[PDB]
Short mmCIF file of N, CA and C and ligand atoms in Angstrom, two decimals:
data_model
loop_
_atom_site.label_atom_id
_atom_site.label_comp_id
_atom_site.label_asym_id
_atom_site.label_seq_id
_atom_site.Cartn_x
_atom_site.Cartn_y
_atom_site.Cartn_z
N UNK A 3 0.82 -1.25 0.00
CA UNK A 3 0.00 0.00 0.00
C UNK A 3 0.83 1.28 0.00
N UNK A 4 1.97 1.02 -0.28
CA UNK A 4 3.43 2.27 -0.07
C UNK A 4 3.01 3.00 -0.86
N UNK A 5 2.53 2.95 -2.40
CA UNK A 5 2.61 4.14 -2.87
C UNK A 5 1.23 4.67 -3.74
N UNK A 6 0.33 3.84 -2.43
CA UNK A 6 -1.27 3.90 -3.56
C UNK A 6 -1.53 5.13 -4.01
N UNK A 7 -1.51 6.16 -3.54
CA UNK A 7 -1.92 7.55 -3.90
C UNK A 7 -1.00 8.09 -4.89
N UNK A 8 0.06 7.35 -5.79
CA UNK A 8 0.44 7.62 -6.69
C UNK A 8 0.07 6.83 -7.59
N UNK A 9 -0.08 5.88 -7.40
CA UNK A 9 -0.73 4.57 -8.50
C UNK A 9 -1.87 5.51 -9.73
N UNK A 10 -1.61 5.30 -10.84
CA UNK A 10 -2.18 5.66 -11.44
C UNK A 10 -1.82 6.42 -13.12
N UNK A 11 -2.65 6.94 -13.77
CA UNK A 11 -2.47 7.68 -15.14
C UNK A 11 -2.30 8.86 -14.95
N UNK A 12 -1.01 9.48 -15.10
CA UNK A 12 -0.90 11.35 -14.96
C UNK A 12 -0.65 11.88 -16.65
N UNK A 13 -1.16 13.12 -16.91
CA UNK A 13 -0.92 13.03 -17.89
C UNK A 13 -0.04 14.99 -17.29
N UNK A 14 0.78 15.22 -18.02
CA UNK A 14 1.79 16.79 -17.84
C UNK A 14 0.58 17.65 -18.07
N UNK A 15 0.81 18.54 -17.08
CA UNK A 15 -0.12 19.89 -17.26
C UNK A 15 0.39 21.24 -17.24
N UNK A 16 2.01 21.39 -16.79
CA UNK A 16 2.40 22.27 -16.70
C UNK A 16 3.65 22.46 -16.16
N UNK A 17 4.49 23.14 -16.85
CA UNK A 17 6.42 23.10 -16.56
C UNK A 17 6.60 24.28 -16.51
N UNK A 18 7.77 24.55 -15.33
CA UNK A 18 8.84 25.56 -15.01
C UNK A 18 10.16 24.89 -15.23
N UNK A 19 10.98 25.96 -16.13
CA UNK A 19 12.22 25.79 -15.87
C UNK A 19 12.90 24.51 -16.47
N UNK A 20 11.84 24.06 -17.06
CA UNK A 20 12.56 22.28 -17.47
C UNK A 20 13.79 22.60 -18.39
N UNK A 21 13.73 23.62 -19.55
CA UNK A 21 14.90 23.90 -20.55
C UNK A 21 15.85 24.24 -19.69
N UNK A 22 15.79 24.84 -18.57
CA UNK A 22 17.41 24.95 -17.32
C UNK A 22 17.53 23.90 -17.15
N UNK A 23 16.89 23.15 -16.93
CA UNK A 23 17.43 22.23 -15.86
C UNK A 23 17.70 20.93 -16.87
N UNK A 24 17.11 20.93 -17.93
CA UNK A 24 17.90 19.84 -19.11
C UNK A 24 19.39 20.47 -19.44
N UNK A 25 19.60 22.25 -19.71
CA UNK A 25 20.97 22.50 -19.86
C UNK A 25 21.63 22.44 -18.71
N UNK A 26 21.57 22.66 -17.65
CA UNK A 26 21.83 22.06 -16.33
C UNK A 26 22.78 20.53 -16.50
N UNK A 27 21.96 19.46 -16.56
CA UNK A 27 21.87 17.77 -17.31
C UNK A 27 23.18 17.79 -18.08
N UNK A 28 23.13 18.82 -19.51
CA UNK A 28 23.74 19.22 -20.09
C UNK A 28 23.15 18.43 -21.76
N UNK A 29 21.96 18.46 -21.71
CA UNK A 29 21.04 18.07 -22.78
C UNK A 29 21.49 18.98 -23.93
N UNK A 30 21.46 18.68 -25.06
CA UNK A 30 22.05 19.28 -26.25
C UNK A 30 20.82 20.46 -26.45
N UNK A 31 20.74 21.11 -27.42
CA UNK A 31 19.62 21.76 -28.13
C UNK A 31 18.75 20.75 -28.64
N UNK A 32 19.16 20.34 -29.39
CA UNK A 32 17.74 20.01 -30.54
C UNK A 32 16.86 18.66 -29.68
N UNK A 33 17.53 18.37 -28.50
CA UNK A 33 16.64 17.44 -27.77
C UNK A 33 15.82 18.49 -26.72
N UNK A 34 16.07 19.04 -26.52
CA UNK A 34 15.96 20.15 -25.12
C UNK A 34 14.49 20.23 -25.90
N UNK A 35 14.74 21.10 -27.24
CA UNK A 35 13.59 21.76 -28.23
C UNK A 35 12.30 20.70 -28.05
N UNK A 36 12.88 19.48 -28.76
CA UNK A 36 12.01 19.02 -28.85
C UNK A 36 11.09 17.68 -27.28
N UNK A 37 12.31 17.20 -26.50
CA UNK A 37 11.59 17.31 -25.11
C UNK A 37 10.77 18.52 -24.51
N UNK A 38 11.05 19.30 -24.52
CA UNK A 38 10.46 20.34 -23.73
C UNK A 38 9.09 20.29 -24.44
N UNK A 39 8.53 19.98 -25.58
CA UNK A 39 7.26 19.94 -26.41
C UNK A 39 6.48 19.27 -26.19
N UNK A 40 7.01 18.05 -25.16
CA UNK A 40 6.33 16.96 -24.77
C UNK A 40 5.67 16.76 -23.65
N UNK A 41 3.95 16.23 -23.96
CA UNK A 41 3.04 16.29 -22.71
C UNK A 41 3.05 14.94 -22.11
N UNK A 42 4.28 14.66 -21.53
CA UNK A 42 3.80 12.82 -21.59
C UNK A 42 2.75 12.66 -20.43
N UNK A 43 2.45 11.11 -20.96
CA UNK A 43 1.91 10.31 -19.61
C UNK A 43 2.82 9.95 -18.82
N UNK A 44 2.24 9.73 -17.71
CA UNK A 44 3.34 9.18 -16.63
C UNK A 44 1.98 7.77 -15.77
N UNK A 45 2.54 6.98 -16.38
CA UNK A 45 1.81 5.72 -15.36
C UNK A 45 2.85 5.25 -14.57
N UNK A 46 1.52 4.91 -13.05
CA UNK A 46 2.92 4.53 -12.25
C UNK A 46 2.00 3.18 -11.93
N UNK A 47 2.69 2.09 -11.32
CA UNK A 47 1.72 0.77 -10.73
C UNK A 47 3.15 0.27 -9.89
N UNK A 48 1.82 -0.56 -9.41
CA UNK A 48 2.38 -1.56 -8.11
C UNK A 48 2.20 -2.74 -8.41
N UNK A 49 3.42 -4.11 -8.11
CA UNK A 49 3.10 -5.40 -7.77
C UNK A 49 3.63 -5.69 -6.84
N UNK A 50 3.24 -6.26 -5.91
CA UNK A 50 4.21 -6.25 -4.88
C UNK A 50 4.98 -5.36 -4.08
N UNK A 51 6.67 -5.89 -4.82
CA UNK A 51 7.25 -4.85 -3.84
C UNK A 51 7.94 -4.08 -5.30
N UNK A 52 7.56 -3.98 -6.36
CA UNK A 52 8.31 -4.02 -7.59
C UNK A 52 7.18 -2.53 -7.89
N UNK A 53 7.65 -1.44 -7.76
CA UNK A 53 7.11 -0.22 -8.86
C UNK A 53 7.72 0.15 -10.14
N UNK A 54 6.51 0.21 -10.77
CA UNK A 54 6.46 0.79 -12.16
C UNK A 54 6.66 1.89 -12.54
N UNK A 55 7.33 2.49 -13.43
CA UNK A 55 6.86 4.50 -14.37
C UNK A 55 6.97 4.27 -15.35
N UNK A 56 5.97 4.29 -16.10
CA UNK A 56 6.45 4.41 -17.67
C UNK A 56 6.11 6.13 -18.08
N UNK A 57 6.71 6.32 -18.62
CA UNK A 57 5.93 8.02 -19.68
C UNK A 57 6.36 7.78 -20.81
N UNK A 58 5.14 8.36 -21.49
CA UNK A 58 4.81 7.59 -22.51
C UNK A 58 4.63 9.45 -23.11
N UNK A 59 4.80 9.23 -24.30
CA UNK A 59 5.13 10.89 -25.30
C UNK A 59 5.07 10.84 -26.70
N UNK A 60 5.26 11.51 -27.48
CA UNK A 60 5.61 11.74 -28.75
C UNK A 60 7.20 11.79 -29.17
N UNK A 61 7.61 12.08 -27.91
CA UNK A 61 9.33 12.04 -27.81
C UNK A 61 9.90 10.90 -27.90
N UNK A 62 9.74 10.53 -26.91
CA UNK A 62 9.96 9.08 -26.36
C UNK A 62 9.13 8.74 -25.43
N UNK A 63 9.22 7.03 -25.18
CA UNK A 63 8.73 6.14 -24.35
C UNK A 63 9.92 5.76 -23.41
N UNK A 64 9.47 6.25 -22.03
CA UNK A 64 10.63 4.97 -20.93
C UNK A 64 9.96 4.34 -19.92
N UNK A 65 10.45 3.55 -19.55
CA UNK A 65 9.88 2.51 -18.27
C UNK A 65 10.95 1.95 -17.34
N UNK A 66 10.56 2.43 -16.02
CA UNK A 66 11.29 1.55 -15.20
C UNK A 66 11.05 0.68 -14.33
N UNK A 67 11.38 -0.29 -13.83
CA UNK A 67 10.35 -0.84 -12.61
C UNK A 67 11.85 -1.02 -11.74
N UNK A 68 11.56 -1.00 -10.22
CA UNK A 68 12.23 -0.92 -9.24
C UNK A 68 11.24 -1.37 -7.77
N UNK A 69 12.43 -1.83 -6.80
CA UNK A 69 12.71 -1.84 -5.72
C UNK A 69 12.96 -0.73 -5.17
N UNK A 70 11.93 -0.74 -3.72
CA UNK A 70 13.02 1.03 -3.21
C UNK A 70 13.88 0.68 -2.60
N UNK A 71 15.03 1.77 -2.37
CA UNK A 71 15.98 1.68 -1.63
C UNK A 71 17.11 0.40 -2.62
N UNK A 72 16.80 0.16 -4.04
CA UNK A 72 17.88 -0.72 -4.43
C UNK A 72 18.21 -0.34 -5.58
N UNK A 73 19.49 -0.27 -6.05
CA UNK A 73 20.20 0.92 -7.10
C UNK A 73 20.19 0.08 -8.50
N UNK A 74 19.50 0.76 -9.43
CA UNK A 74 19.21 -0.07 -10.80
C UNK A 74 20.00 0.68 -11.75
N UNK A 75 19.98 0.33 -13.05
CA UNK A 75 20.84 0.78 -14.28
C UNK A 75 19.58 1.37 -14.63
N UNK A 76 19.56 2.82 -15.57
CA UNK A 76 18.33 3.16 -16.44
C UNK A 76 18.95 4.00 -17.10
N UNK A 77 18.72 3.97 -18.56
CA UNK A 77 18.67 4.99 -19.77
C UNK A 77 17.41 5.81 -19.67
N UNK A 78 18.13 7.43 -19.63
CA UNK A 78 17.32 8.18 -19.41
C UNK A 78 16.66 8.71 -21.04
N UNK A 79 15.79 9.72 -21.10
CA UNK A 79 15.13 9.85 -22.35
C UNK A 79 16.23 10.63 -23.07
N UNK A 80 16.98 11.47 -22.68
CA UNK A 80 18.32 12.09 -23.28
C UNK A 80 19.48 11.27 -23.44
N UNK A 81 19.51 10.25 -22.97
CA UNK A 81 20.16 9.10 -23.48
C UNK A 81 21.51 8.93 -22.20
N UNK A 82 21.51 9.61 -21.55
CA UNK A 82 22.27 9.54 -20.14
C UNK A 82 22.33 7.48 -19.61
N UNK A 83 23.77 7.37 -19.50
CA UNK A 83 23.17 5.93 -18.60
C UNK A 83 23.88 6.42 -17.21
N UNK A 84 22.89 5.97 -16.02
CA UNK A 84 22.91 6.34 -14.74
C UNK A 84 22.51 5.42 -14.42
N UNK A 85 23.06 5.07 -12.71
CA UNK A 85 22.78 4.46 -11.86
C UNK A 85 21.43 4.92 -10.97
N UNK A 86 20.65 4.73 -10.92
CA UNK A 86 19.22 5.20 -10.06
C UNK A 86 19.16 4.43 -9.00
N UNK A 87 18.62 5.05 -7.73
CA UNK A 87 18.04 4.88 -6.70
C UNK A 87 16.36 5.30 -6.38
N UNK A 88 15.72 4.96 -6.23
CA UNK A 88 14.59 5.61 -5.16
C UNK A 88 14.27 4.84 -4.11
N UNK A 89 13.86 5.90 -3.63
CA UNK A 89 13.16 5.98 -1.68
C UNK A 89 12.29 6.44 -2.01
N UNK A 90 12.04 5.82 -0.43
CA UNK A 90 10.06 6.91 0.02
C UNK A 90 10.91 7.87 0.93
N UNK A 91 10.52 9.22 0.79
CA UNK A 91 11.24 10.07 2.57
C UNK A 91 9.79 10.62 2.61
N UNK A 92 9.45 10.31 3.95
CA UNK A 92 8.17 10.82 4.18
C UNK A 92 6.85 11.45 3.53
N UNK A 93 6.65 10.43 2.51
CA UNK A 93 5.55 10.00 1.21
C UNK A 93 5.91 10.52 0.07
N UNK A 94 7.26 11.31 -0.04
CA UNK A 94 7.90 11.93 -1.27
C UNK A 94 8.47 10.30 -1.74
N UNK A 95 8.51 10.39 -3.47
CA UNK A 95 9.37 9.40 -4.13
C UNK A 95 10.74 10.15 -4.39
N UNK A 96 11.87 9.84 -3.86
CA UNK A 96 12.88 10.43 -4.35
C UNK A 96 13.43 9.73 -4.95
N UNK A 97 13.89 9.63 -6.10
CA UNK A 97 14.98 9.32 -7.44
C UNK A 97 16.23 9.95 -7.85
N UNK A 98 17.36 9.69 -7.00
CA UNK A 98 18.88 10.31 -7.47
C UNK A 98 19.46 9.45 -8.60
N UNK A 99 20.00 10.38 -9.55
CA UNK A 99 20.86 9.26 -10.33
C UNK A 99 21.93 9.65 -10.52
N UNK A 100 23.15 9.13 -10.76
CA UNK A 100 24.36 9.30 -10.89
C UNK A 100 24.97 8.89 -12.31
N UNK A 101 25.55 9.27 -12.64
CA UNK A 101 26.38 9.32 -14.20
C UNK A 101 27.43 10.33 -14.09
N UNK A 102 28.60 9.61 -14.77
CA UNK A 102 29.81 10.70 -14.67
C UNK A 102 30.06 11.62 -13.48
N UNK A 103 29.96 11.10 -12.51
CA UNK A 103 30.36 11.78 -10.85
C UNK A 103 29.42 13.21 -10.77
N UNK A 104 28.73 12.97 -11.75
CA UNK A 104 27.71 14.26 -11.47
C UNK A 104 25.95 13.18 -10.57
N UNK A 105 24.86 13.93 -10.22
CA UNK A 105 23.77 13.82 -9.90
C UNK A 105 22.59 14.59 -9.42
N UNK A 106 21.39 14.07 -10.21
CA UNK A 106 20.11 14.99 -10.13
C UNK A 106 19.45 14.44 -9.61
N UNK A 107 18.53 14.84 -8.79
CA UNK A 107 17.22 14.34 -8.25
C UNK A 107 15.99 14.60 -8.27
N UNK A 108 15.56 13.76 -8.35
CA UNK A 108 13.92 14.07 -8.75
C UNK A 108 12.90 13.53 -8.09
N UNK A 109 11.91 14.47 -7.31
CA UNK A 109 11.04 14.11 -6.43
C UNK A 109 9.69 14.11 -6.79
N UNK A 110 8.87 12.92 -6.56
CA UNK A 110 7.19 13.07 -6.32
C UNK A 110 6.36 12.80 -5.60
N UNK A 111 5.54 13.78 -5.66
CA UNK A 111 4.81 14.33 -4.62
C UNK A 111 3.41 14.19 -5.08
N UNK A 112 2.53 13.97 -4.30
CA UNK A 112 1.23 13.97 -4.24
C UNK A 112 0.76 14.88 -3.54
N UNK A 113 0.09 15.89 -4.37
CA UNK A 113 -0.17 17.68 -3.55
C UNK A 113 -1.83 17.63 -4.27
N UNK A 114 -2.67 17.73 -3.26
CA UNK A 114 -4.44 17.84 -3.85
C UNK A 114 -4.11 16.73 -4.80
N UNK A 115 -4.89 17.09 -5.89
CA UNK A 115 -5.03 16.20 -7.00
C UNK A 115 -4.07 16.22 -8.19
N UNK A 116 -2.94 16.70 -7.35
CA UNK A 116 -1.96 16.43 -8.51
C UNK A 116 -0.93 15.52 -7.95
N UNK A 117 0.19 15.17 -9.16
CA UNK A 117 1.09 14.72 -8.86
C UNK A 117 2.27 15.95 -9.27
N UNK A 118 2.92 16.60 -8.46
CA UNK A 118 3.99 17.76 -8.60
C UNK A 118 5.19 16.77 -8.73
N UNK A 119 6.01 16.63 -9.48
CA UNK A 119 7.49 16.62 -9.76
C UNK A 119 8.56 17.45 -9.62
N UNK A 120 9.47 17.49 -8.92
CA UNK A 120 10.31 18.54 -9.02
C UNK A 120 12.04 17.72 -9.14
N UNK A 121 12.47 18.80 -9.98
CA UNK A 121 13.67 17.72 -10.57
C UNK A 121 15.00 18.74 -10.52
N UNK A 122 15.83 18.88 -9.84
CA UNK A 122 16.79 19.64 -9.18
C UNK A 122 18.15 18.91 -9.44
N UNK A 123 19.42 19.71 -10.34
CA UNK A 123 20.25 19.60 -10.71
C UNK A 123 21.45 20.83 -10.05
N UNK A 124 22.20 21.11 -9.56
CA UNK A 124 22.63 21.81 -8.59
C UNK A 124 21.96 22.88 -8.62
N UNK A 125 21.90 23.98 -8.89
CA UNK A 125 21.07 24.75 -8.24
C UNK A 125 19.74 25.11 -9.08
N UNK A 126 19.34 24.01 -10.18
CA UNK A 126 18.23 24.38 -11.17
C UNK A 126 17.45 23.53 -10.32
N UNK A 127 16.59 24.37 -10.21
CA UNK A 127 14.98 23.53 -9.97
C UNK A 127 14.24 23.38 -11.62
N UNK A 128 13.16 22.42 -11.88
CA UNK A 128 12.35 22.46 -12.82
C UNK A 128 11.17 22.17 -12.25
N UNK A 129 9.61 22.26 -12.01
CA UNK A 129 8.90 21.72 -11.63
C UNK A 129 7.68 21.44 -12.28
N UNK A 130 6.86 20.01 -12.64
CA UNK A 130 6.06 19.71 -13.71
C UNK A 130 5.21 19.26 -12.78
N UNK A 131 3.81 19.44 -13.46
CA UNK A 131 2.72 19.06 -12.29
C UNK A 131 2.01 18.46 -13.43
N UNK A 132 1.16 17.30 -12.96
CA UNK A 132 0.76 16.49 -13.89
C UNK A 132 -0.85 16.26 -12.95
N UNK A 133 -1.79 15.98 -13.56
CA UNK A 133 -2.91 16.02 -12.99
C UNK A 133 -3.03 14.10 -13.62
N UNK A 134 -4.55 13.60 -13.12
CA UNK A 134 -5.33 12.37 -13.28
C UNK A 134 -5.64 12.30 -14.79
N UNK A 135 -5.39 11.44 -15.98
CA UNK A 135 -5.79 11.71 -17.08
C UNK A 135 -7.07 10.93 -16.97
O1 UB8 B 201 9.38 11.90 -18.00
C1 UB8 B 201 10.56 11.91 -17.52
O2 UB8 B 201 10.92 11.10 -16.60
C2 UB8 B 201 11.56 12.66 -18.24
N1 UB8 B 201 12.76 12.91 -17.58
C3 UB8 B 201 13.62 13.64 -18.40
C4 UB8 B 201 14.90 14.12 -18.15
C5 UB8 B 201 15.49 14.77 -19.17
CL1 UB8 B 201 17.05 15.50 -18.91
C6 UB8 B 201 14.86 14.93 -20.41
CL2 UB8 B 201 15.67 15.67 -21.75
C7 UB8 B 201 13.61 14.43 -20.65
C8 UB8 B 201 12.92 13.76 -19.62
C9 UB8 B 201 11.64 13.11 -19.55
C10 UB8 B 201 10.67 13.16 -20.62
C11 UB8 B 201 10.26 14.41 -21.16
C12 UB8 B 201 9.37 14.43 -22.21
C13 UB8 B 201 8.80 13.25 -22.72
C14 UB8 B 201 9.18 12.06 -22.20
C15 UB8 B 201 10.08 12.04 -21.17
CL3 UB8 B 201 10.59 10.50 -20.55
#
């Protein structure tokens, strides 16, 4: 029951700052351009002890499924390969990943009826709020 109140279909409703915080990343242009255009879905599910995310776009498609607290391999949609983690810290999902001795993190949150994301690269915040599709 860890993460029922995220379980579900989000679809993007609204971004700050995401083009910082992809040059931040150090995302090229012509991906930045055309990520930043993108309203994905974000499904999340549960089996067990195994969570799901897929987002799903016109950009790209990714999916991960994980253990919390146990460090997986994932190709990010900019093509980054990083080591990922997530936790629960007090009903936040936090997701650090590491690549090239650098790391970003990215948190979600369940605020009213949204799901808020916020994705912080040293001092860039970006924050995407995604509502129930
Ligand atoms: O959804 C996410 O988890 C996500 N995280 C990112 C990190 C970086 Cl640096 C960039 Cl360029 C893009 C993304 C995306 C994304 C953005 C648009 C469509 C699909 C996706 Cl997957």
């Amino acid at each position: 029951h860890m993460c029922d109140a995220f379980v579900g279909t989000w679809k993007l409703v609204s971004s700050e700052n995401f083009d910082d915080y992809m040059k931040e990343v150090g995302v090229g242009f012509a991906t930045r351009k055309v990520a930043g255009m993108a309203k994905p879905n974000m499904i999340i599910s549960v089996n067990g002890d195994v969570i799901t995310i897929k987002s799903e776009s016109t950009f790209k498609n990714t999916e991960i499924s994980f253990i919390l607290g146990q460090e997986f391999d994932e190709v990010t949609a900019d093509d980054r390969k990083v080591k990922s983690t997530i936790t629960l810290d007090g009903g936040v999902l936090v997701h650090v990943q590491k690549w090239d001795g650098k790391s970003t993190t990215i948190k979600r949150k369940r605020e009213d009826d949204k799901l808020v994301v916020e994705c912080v690269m040293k001092g860039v915040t970006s924050t995407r709020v995604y509502e129930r599709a």
